[PDB]
Design a protein around this nucleic acid. Structure first.
Ligand SMILES: [Ca+2]
Ligand SMILES: [Mn+2]
Ligand SMILES: [Mn+2]
Length: 430
DNA sequence: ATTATGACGCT
DNA sequence: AGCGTCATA
């Protein structure tokens, strides 16, 4: 009872941009705004591969991973924007730079953890405490939460969407104890007020809309964020977790979308996150290991302790290209040319990074895939990265992989290469 | 013939 | 270190 940790010590948010690469292209080209549209890379093979889709286009059934030619079958008026191509490959610089815009705004409010190109976690615990003492114990108006959903509400004893949102919010605010500076529900609510402000700032200063989740930890904040996309934010309280989890497929929780999650389902014979509560911590540890078992035992009760890491910049800078089917590299001159292409983009990004961020990478990782291998990567070798020079890096990369050539002829490369990857790692302050 | 990334876990 | 898992546009 009195000693049962409830994992309600923190306020954590996850902010995720809506249809992010699409919004980047729509800002640039006003003709794409408020239209079914998607972002595509390459074009020759089946119209190119879709990597982002506007909500108008999702209404037609267009999804990520779809070939654009196939997407056009569902949505003949689908508009497309192409990823830039430089040095023979897709170049994602525009989206990386747009990401920096958003991350710098978020950093004004709190320490952030960059979790992807389009999302970051925020630990708002301290900011909430500050805002609470500022408020001087006066109630929180619904007007301060104009885009917030309270998950699980309304409930108990209007047929429009916005009507339902306000009803739930009213019920929530009506129940709040604003006299208690330590009530977790109140702390989450103030957290949500700050996130409204953060999200307003992002939209004002970039033109980009986003969604957000506010809860007591990262996993719940991430889950919350997706519940009412686009352009809305969702508060998932500790108390909302039993009902929420009672019909929540296990694969929906971050880190359980793959083999581990499938094993939880198969081994335990369950489907929903809430069903995990019936197992002892030792039982879960027996099946899924010490770390996973403890994590599952607490997570199915809404509790997780993974900190928001103070890290706004990516830890690695990498350049990758596939060479599918018949385009696989079968000559040494081919392999060397593409290593140079990759190394030149890497040099460009590394030099910008050194100037912007006062650091230098010290290790070069080289990875390849060979025709036939189901694995995404076939071989990964590291060497020293001592100078930001594309010609040196590409020569070094070749040196570390050249023994993979099974061909007796050194001019030929066998078996052909279907992927090259160069990654700079192990940064030090400079 | 989704592709281009990027973090973190295991041994 | 090299490999695997899981994740996101
Ligand atoms: Ca997003
Ligand atoms: Mn995202
Ligand atoms: Mn997505």
């Amino acid at each position: 009872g009195p000693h049962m940790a409830t994992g309600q010590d923190r306020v954590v948010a996850l902010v995720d941009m809506d249809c992010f690469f699409v919004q980047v292209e729509q800002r640039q080209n006003p003709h794409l705004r408020n239209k079914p549209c998607a972002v595509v890379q390459y074009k020759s093979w089946k119209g190119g591969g879709i990597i982002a889709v506007s909500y108008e286009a999702r209404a037609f059934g267009v999804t990520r991973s779809m070939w654009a030619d196939d997407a056009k079958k569902l949505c003949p008026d689908l508009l497309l924007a192409q990823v830039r191509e430089s040095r023979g490959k897709a170049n994602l610089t525009k989206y990386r730079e747009a990401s920096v815009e958003v991350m710098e705004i978020m950093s004004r409010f709190a320490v952030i953890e960059r979790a992807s190109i389009d999302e970051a976690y925020v630990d708002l615990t301290s900011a909430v405490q500050e805002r609470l003492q500022k408020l001087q114990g006066q109630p929180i108006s619904a007007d301060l939460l104009p885009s917030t959903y309270i998950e699980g509400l309304p409930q108990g004893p209007t047929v429009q969407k916005e009507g339902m949102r306000k009803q739930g919010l009213f019920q929530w605010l009506d129940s709040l104890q604003i006299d208690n500076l330590t009530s977790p529900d109140l702390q989450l609510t103030v957290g949500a007020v700050i996130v409204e402000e953060m999200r307003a700032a992002i939209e004002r200063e970039t033109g980009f809309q986003c969604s957000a989740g506010i809860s007591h930890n990262k996993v719940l904040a991430k889950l919350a964020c997706g519940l009412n996309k686009p352009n809305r934010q969702t508060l998932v309280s500790h108390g909302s977790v039993p009902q929420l989890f009672s019909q929540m497929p296990i694969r929906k929780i971050r880190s359980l979308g793959g083999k581990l999650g499938a094993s939880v389902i198969e081994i335990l014979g369950i489907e929903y996150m809430g069903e995990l509560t019936q197992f002892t911590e030792s039982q879960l540890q027996s099946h899924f290991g010490e770390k996973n078992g403890s994590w599952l035992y607490a997570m199915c009760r809404g509790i997780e302790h993974d900190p928001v890491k103070p890290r706004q910049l990516p830890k690695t800078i990498g350049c990758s290209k596939n060479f599918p089917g018949k385009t696989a590299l079968a000559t040494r001159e081919q392999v060397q040319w593409w290593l140079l292409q990759l190394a030149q983009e890497l040099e460009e990004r590394l030099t910008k990074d050194r100037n912007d961020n006062d650091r230098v990478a010290t290790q070069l990782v080289v990875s390849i895939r060979v025709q036939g291998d189901k694995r995404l990567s076939s071989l990964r070798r590291c060497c020293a990265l001592t100078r930001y020079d594309a010609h040196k890096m590409s020569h070094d990369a070749f040196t570390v992989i050249k023994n993979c050539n099974t061909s007796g002829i050194q001019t030929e490369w066998s078996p052909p290469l279907t992927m090259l990857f160069l990654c700079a790692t192990k940064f030090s302050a400079s």
